[PDB]
């Protein structure tokens, strides 16, 4: 199948309490594999998946140097943005960045992306062409004009089409048993009365990977979102995910309702009925 590598970072200023807190994590699809935390004692990039541990000490030296270098950029940018927005020195602010690349089944580059946020709102994003930017407001337009003039997108594009893809290809093989798997949802329905006249049907999906799933309720084969409810997909803690969807129904009409489950690991979508 197709796959992604993504790096996420969060820098939080702490005025009058030292350097910003910087935390970075790397993922291949929905599997985390590295972390760095500027408050931790090691001051190293650290493994967070079994299949990255085999990388040799040169790898960890490289990842540590490069994640620390990004943390220095972000610390200076916290000051710059405080200035762009004419904000006080007293307040804590956050810069978040996510970038990544996607490959197909044969490892060919599909697409790259990079997005930046300030205080949890869009700040600047690389466009899908990997050649130009979209700024969210007048401050980010300063950054846009600067990065355009410096041809910065060219360096990012070279990473996203090049290094990014090569390393993702490698991780997919070294971590094949974990990363090239699809675990289909184990599904079941529960049924309980709410009262004399209504019952709850709950449709469960357990133990699935990757996290992407769709749970749909239908009524006489026609889509139904009136009187339904679904929880956010959640991690089980062991590398699989859980989700459920429920519907409140008139007692005696359970037969009309169907739960439909779509997941990459199912040859065919499932239909569950009570």
């Amino acid at each position: 199948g197709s796959h992604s590598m993504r790096y996420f970072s969060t820098s939080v200023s702490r005025p009058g309490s030292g350097e910003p807190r910087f935390i970075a994590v790397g993922y291949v699809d929905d599997t985390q594999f590295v972390r760095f935390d500027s408050d931790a004692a090691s001051q190293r990039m650290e493994p967070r998946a079994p299949w990255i541990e085999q990388e040799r000490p040169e790898y960890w030296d490289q990842e540590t140097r490069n994640v620390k270098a990004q943390s220095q950029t972000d610390r200076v940018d916290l000051g710059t943005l405080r200035g762009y927005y004419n904000q006080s020195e007293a307040g804590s602010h956050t810069i978040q960045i996510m970038y990544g690349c996607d490959v197909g089944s044969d490892g060919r580059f599909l697409r790259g992306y990079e997005q930046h946020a300030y205080d949890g709102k869009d700040y600047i994003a690389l466009n899908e062409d990997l050649r130009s930017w979209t700024a969210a407001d007048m401050a980010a337009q300063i950054t846009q004009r600067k990065w355009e003039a410096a041809r910065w997108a060219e360096q990012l594009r070279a990473y996203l089409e090049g290094t990014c893809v090569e390393w993702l290809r490698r991780y997919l093989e070294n971590g094949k048993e974990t990363l090239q798997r699809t675990d289909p949802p184990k599904t079941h329905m529960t049924h309980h009365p709410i009262s004399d006249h209504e019952a709850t049907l709950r449709c469960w999906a357990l133990g699935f990977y990757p996290a992407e799933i769709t749970l749909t309720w239908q009524r006489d084969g026609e889509d139904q979102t009136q009187d339904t409810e679904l929880v956010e997909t959640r991690p089980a803690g062991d590398g699989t995910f859980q989700k459920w969807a429920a519907v409140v129904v008139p007692s005696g009409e359970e037969q009309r309702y169907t739960c439909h489950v779509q997941h990459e690991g199912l040859p065919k979508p499932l239909t569950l009925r009570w």
Binding site: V34, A69, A150, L156, T163, W167
Partner: peptide, 9 residues
Amino acid sequence: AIFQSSMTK
């Protein structure tokens, strides 16, 4: 592997 480059805003 993380991107080795970054540019200030």
